[PDB]
Amino acid sequence: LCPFGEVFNATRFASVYAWNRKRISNCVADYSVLYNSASFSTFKCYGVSNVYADSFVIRGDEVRQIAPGQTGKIADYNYKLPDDFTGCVIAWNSNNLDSKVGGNYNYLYRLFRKSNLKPFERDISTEIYQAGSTPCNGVEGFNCYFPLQSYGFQPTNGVGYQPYRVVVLSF
Amino acid sequence: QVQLVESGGGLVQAGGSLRLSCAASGRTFSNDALGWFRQAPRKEREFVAAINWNSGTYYADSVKGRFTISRDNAKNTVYLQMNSLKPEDTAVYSCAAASDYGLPREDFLYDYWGQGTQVTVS
Amino acid sequence: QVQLVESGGGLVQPGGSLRLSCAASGITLDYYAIGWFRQAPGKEREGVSRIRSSDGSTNYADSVKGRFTMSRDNAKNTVYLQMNSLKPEDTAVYYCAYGPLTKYGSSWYWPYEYDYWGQGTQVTVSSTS
Ligand SMILES: C[N+](C)(CCCS(=O)(=O)[O-])Cc1ccccc1
């Protein structure tokens, strides 16, 4: 039986730009997660009505970008699902775990990339991004940006800016 | 395009009870999550209660113990039973539907919206 | 929550000065940047200056270095832009903006995106109107 429990119950979750992948050997399907879909804010499947569990944190307003065919900073530069995705996307609000007073800066997202990610590609590099015409030479300025940014989650944020834990099951 | 129409709003006295209903068109009702939200003057929209395909439910803390959400798939209808009403419950209540097996409590994760019905608690 | 309100814009002749204020409420992040930006019709928005709550350093756009100075009030949540030697090309709506810094390991980095923007104050540098 598939060890999905370890995936959902993990104490720590990755930043989306450094999204975590867990390979799960061929297993007896454990449907209890589906029957407990009420535990989650969203539970959607694609290509269903080789198992990977990918997981990470994003903000509430980005949950809709975790789906095939989406656009935006997350789908384009952080975590991209293919058009022929077969699997499920599950997410829940984690404000209780992942915000802190004065801001939790540990979760990051990539702002900029010279081209979009391919589906299931990851990029964790931190080269200073050249937004204008002069080379950056590793130095920040108004044309030269560190390519990641912190969410800064605070418990008092509105729900669209609260942290969400996401699990993507590909099978 | 799924049409949602709320019924049941009105004037009630504090401590009274009132049942809202929302009729949905569309063939996928039984798999959808259905939610209720409310908007009071000068206040921002707030989640009230929601039910998913498997009849699991979730309530805002402010209404737990007093309100009950339920669904009748044969009638494409969701209901909000509101007991022990306080004047702080006065609001326009709206129903929403989501093509989602989860239990969304966030307005941005719903897909279709009704028109609202007024509930006023004196 | 967060409110940013700019004031102090106006009309001045070339070579003149103005001081803009940005009154902020609701600042609760520990590690943040405040920026001044400007936008004119038909031009791209431009960063003008920025300051941060980690090390207090300030950066200025090349076009304004040595003419503009950004600072923090020591007794209220207001930041200033002192603009000296104004030029017609400085004409724009000036905005202040606030958002979190980026923590990467033990280092802090400047953001590109800011969470909150104010409503702008108009600065017009002109020999007439
Ligand atoms: C006025 N400060 C000294 C901070 C005041 C923070 S408090 O009101 O929460 O005590 C400096 C300052 C900080 C941000 C913006 C402008 C000025």
Numbering used by the authors:
A (entry chain A): 335 to 383, 394 to 515
B (entry chain B): 1 to 122
C (entry chain C): 1 to 129
What do the paper's sentences say?
Using alpaca immune libraries against the receptor‐binding domain (RBD) of the SARS‐CoV‐2 Spike protein, we isolated 45 infection‐blocking VHH antibodies. Single‐domain VHH antibodies (also called nanobodies) are derived from camelid heavy‐chain‐only antibodies, whose antigen‐binding sites are composed of just one peptide chain (Hamers‐Casterman et al, 1993). Infection is initiated when the Receptor‐Binding Domain (RBD) of the SARS‐CoV‐2 Spike docks to angiotensin‐converting enzyme 2 (ACE2), a plasma membrane protein of the target cell.
For structural analysis, we next prepared a ternary complex of the RBD with the fold‐promoter Re9F06 and the potently neutralizing Re5D06 by co‐expressing all three entities. The structure shows one Re9F06·RBD·Re5D06 complex per asymmetric unit. The highly potent VHH Re5D06 clashes extensively with ACE2; in fact, it uses a very similar binding site on the RBD. The buried interface is extensive (˜ 2,135 Å2) and features perfect shape‐complementarity between the nanobody and its target. It includes salt bridges (direct and water‐mediated), cation‐π interactions, hydrogen bonds, planar and T‐shaped π stacking interactions, and other hydrophobic contacts. The interactions encompass the long CDR3 loop, CDR1, as well as residues of the nanobody scaffold, such as R50 and R52. On the RBD side, seven residues are particularly noteworthy. These include four tyrosines (Y449, Y453, Y489, Y505) and three phenylalanines (F456, F486, F490), suggesting that the nanobody covers a rather "sticky" area of the RBD. The clash with the fold‐promoter Re9F06 is small but sufficient to prevent docking to ACE2, explaining its neutralizing activity. The clash is not caused by an overlap of the RBD‐binding sites of VHH and ACE2, but rather by an overlap between the VHH scaffold and its CDR2 loop with ACE2 (compare Fig 6A with 6B). The crystal structure of the RBD⋅Re5D06 complex revealed a potentially destabilizing cavity within the nanobody's hydrophobic core.
